[PDB]
Design a protein around this nucleic acid. Structure first.
Ligand SMILES: [Mg+2]
Ligand SMILES: [Mg+2]
Length: 70
RNA sequence: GUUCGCGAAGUAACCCUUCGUGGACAUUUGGUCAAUUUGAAACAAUACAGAGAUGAUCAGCAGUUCCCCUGCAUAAGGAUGAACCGUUUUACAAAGAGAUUU
């Protein structure tokens, strides 16, 4: 409700509230992973990520049906 | 062929026959169409695939069409019945700038 009143995402609101009132281990599941910052990648790529971008370009390419391709 | 006569001949006698002869009755069917190849139904078999919006598998309702089929149909089916998916240029003008000619 508060984040709706401020037109800001709620995770930003919670962390900034913690910063106002102030003045993770390994092997845990992070529930807040979608709201958190991304991880940039190692220089070459992983193999599964090469496969992912290949099939992603292949699925973003096609704009036809079965009848039209035939 | 029937019927009403009108004459001759046979027996006649008023009938019954052969024969000629005038009238009456009855009066135009059928084809749009000829009997095996050359004037027009079509499917089915061998071969290939194995159904639209899909990443995959499907329910469908429509629409437009000089395509229709099954159906008693103005119902409903036929893969949502199917074809639909391509090719794409001019009602062409205004202001400014740079070179050629007068
Ligand atoms: Mg249809
Ligand atoms: Mg139908």
């Amino acid at each position: 409700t508060i984040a709706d009143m401020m037109a800001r995402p709620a995770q930003v609101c919670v962390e900034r509230y913690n910063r106002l009132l102030e003045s993770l281990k390994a092997g845990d599941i992070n529930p807040n992973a979608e709201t958190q910052m991304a991880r940039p990648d190692n220089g070459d790529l992983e193999d599964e990520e090469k496969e992912m971008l290949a099939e992603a370009r292949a699925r973003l390419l096609n704009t036809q049906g079965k009848k039209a391709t035939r």
